[PDB]
JSON list of C-alpha atoms in Angstrom, two decimals:
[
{"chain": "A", "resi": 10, "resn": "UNK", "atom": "CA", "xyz": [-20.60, 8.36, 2.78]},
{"chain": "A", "resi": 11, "resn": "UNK", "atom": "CA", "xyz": [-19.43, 5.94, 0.14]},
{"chain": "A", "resi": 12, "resn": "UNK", "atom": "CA", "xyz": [-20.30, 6.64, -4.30]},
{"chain": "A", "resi": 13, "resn": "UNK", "atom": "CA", "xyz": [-21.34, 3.61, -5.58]},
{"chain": "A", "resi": 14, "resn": "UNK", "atom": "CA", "xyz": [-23.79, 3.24, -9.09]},
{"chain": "A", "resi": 15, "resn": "UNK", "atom": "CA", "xyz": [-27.13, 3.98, -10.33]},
{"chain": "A", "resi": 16, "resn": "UNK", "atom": "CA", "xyz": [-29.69, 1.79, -8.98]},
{"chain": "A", "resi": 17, "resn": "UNK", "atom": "CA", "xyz": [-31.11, 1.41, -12.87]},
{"chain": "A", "resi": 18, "resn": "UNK", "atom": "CA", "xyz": [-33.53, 3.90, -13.61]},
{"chain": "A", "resi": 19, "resn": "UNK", "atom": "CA", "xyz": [-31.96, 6.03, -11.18]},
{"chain": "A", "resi": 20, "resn": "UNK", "atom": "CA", "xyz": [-29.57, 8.84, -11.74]},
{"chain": "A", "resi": 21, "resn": "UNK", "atom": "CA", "xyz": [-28.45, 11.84, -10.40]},
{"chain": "A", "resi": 22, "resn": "UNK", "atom": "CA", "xyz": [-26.29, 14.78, -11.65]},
{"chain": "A", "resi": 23, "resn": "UNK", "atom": "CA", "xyz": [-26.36, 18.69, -12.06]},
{"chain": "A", "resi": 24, "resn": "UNK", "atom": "CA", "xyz": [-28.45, 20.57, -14.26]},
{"chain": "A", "resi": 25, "resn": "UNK", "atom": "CA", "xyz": [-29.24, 24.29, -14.75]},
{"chain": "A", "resi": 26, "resn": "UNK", "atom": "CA", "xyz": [-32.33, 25.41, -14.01]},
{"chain": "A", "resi": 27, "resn": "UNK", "atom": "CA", "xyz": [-35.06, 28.68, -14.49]},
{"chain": "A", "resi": 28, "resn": "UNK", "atom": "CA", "xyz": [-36.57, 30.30, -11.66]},
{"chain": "A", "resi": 29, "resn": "UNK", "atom": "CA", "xyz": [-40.28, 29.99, -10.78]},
{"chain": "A", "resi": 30, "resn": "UNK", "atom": "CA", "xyz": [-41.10, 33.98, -9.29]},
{"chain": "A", "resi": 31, "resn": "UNK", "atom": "CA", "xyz": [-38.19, 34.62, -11.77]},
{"chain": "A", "resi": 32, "resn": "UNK", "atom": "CA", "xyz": [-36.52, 33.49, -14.62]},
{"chain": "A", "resi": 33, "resn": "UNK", "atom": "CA", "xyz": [-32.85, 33.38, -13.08]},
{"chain": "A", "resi": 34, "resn": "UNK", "atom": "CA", "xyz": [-30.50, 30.75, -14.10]},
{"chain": "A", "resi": 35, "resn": "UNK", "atom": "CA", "xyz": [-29.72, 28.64, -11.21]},
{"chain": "A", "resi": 36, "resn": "UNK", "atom": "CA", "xyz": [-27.22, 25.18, -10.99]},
{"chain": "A", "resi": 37, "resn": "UNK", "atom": "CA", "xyz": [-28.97, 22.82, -9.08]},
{"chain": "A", "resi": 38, "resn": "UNK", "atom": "CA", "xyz": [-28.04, 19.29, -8.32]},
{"chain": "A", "resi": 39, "resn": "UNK", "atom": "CA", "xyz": [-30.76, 16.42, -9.66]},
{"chain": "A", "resi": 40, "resn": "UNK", "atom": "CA", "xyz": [-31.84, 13.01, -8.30]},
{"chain": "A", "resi": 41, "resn": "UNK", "atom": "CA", "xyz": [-34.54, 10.48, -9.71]},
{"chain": "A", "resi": 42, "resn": "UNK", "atom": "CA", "xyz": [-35.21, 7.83, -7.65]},
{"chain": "A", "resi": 43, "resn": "UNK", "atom": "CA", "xyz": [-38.35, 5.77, -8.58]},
{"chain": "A", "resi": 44, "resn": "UNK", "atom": "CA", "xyz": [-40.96, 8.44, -9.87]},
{"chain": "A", "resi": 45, "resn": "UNK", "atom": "CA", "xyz": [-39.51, 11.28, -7.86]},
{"chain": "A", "resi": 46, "resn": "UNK", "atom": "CA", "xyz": [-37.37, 13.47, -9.12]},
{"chain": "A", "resi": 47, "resn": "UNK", "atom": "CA", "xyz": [-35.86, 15.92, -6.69]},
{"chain": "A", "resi": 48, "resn": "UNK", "atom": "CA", "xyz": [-33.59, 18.77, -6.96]},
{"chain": "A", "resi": 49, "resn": "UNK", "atom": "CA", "xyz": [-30.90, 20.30, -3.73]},
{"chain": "A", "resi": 50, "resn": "UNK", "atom": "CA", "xyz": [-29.35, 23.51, -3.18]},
{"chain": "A", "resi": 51, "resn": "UNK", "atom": "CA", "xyz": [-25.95, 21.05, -3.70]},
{"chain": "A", "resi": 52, "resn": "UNK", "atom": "CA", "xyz": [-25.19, 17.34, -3.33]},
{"chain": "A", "resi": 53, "resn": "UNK", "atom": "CA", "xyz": [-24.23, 17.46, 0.24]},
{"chain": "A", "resi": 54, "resn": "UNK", "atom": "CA", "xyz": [-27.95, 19.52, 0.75]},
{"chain": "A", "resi": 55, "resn": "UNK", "atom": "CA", "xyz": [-29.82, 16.90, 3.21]},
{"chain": "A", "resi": 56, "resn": "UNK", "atom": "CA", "xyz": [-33.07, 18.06, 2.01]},
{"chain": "A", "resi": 57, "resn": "UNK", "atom": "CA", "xyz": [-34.36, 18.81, -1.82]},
{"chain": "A", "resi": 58, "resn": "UNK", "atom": "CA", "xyz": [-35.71, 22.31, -2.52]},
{"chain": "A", "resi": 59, "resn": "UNK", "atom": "CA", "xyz": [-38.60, 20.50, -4.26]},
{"chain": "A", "resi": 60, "resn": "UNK", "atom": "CA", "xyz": [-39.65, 17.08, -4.93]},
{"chain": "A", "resi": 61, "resn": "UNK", "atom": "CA", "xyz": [-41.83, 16.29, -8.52]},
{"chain": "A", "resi": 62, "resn": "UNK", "atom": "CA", "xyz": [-43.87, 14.00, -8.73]},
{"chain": "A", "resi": 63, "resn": "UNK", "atom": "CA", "xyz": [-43.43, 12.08, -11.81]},
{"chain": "A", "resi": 64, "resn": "UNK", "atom": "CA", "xyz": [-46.93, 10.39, -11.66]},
{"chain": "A", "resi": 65, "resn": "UNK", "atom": "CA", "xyz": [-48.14, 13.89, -12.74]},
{"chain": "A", "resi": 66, "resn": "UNK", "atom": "CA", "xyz": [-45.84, 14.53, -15.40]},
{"chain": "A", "resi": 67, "resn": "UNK", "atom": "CA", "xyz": [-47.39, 14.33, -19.16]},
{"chain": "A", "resi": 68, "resn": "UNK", "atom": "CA", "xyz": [-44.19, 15.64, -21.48]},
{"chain": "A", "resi": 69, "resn": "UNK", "atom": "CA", "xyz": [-40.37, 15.71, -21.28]},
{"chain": "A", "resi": 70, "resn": "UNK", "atom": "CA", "xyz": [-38.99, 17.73, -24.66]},
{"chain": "A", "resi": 71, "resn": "UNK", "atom": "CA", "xyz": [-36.06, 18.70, -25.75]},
{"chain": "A", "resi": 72, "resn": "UNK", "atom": "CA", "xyz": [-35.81, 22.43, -26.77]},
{"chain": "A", "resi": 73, "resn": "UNK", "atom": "CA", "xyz": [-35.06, 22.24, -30.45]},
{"chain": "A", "resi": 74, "resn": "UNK", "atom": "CA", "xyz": [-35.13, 26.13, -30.62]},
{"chain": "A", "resi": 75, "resn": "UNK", "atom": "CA", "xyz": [-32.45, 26.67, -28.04]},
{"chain": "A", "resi": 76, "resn": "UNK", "atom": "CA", "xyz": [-29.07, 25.68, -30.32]},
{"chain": "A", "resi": 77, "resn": "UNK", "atom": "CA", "xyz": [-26.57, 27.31, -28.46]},
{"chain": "A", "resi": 78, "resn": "UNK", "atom": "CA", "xyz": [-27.33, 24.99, -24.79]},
{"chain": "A", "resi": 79, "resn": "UNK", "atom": "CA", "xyz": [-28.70, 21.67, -24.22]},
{"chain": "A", "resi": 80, "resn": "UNK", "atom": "CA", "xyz": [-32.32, 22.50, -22.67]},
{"chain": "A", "resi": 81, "resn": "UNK", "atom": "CA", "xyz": [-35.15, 20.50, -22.21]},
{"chain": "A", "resi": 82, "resn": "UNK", "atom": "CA", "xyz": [-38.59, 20.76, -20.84]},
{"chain": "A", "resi": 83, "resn": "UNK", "atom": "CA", "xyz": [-40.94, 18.97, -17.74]},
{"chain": "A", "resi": 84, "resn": "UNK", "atom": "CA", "xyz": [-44.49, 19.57, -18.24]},
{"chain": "A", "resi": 85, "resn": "UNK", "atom": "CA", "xyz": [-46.59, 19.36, -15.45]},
{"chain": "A", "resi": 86, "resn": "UNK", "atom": "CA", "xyz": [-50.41, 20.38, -14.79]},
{"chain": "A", "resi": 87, "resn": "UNK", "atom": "CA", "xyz": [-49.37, 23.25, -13.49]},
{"chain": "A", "resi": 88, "resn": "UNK", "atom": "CA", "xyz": [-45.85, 24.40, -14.52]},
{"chain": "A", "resi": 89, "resn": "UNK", "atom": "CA", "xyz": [-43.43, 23.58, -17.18]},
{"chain": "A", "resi": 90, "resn": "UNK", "atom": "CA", "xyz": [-39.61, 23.46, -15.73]},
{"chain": "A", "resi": 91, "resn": "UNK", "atom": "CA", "xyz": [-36.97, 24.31, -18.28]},
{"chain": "A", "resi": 92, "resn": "UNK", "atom": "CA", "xyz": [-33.57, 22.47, -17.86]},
{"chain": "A", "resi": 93, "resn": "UNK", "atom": "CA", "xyz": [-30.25, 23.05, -19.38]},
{"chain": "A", "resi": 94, "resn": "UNK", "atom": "CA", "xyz": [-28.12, 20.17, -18.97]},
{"chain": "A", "resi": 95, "resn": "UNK", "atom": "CA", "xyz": [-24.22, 21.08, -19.31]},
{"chain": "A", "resi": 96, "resn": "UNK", "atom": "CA", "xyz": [-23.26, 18.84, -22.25]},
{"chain": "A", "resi": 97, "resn": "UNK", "atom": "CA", "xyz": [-25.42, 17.23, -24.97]},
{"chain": "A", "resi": 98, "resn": "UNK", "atom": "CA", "xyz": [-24.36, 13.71, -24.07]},
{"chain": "A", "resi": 99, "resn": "UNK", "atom": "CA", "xyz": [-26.06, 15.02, -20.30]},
{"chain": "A", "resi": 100, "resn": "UNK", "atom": "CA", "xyz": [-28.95, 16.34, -21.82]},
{"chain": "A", "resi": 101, "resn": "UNK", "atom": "CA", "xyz": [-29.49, 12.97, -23.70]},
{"chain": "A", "resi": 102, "resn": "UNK", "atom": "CA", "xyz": [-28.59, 10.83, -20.56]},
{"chain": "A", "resi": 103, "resn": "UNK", "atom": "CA", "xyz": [-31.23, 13.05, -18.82]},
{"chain": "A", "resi": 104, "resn": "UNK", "atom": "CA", "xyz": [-34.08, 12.73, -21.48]},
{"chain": "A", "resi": 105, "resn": "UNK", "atom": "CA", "xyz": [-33.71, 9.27, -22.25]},
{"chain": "A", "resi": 106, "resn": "UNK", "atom": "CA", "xyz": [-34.02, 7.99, -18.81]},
{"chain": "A", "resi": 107, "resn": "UNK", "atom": "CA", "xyz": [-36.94, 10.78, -18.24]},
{"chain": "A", "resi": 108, "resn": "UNK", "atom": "CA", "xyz": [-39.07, 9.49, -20.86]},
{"chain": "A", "resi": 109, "resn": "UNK", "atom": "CA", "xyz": [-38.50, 5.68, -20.31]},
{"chain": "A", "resi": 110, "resn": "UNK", "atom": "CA", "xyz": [-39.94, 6.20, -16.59]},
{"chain": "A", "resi": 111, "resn": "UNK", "atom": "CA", "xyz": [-43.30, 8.07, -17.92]},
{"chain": "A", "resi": 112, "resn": "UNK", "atom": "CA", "xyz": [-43.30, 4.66, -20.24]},
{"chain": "A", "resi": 113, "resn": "UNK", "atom": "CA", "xyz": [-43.35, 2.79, -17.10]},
{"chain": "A", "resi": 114, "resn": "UNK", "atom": "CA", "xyz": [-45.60, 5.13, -15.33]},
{"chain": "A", "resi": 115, "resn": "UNK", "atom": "CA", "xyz": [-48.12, 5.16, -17.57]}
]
């Protein structure tokens, strides 16, 4: 394998992440490719843990409330993911890009 760039409106990176049964803290590493955004054990994973479906997504917020990490969250019809990114500049990165491709989307 050989690192390259973002394919614009693409990006990939780790962010921290809360549990679905329960509400553990778990590092997982991020990719967004078109309207998919999927999310792997680690980078070297071949296969994502999940895959969401942008299409279905209807709100990407930052977590005012939280002042002590950089969280934000992905609402979906039928679950809300909560996502810490590791620096603010990350967490901006992460949102900006986020919210531009629910512009295009919708």
């Amino acid at each position: 394998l050989v690192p390259t760039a973002p394919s614009l409106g693409t990006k990939e990176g780790y962010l921290t992440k809360q549990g679905g049964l329960v509400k553990t803290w778990k590092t997982r590493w991020f990719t967004l490719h078109r309207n998919e955004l999927k999310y792997f054990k680690d980078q070297m994973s071949p296969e994502p843990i999940r895959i969401l479906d942008l299409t279905e997504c209807s709100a990407v917020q930052f977590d005012y409330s939280q002042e002590r990490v950089n969280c934000f969250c992905l609402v979906f019809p039928f679950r809300t993911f909560y996502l810490c990114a590791k620096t603010g500049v990350e967490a901006d990165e992460w949102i900006k890009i986020l919210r531009w491709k629910l512009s295009q989307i919708r």
